[PDB]
């Protein structure tokens, strides 16, 4: 449509921003979770795609919960001053409000909290995008029509 004055995020920075992809395919036997066949295909399609948009993308594979927390926390402590935004894509097993690491479960809220305005001042007023591909329960949609 019409790109009206400043109703749009300023995209005039040195770079578009960092894009972190967490590709969790294999999980510890104890978690009861199985292999997520087809996830590498998503990780490849996604990485190419976000690189095309101008993002500096990084792909992480089979991360533990501690690793995801740490990896995201260090990403929030970087200097994003010259970045237009930040993106994070999580590909894994999930249940309501939680996402699976290879060794267990961690709250999605805790992962994204690292980037709140009071905890990541260099991404203040900048869009923080999270694309999440994980189940959120067991209920299946039967449809209609």
């Amino acid at each position: 449509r019409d790109r009206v004055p400043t109703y749009q995020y300023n995209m005039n920075f040195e770079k578009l921003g960092k894009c972190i992809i967490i590709n969790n395919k294999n999980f510890d036997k104890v978690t009861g979770m199985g292999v997520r066949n087809g996830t590498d295909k998503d990780a490849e399609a996604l990485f190419k795609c976000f690189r095309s948009l101008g993002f500096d993308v990084i792909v992480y594979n089979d991360c533990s919960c501690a690793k995801m927390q740490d990896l995201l926390k260090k990403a929030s402590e970087e200097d994003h001053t010259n970045a237009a935004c930040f993106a994070c894509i999580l590909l894994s097993h999930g249940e309501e409000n939680v996402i699976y690491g290879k060794d267990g479960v961690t709250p999605i809220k805790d992962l994204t909290a690292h980037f709140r305005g009071d905890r990541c001042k260099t991404l203040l007023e900048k869009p923080k995008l999270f694309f999440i591909q994980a189940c959120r329960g067991t209920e299946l949609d039967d449809g209609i029509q």
């Binding site: 109703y7 749009q8 997520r36 101008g54 309501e96 305005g117 009071d118 999270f130 591909q133 449809g143």
Partner: protein, 92 residues
Amino acid sequence: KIPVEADFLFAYSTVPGYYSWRSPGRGSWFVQALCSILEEHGKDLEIMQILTRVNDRVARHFESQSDDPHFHEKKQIPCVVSMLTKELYFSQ
């Protein structure tokens, strides 16, 4: 000042409490769709237009089919949560 929760956008592959479909050979529905729309319009559509289109794609184009009747012919609808305060374009 700015709220600590502002400027966040969460695009979940499925609505709260449901299941998300994925092909062992094709990749997941949400991702296939997302990447498709982004290739085509990523640089000329506002983020919400892109995600609304992804919502339509997953909702229409797909329908599961397993040997098990319980998981047979099921639908999926992505879910977007926005705390953004401006329109987002990845270009210009």
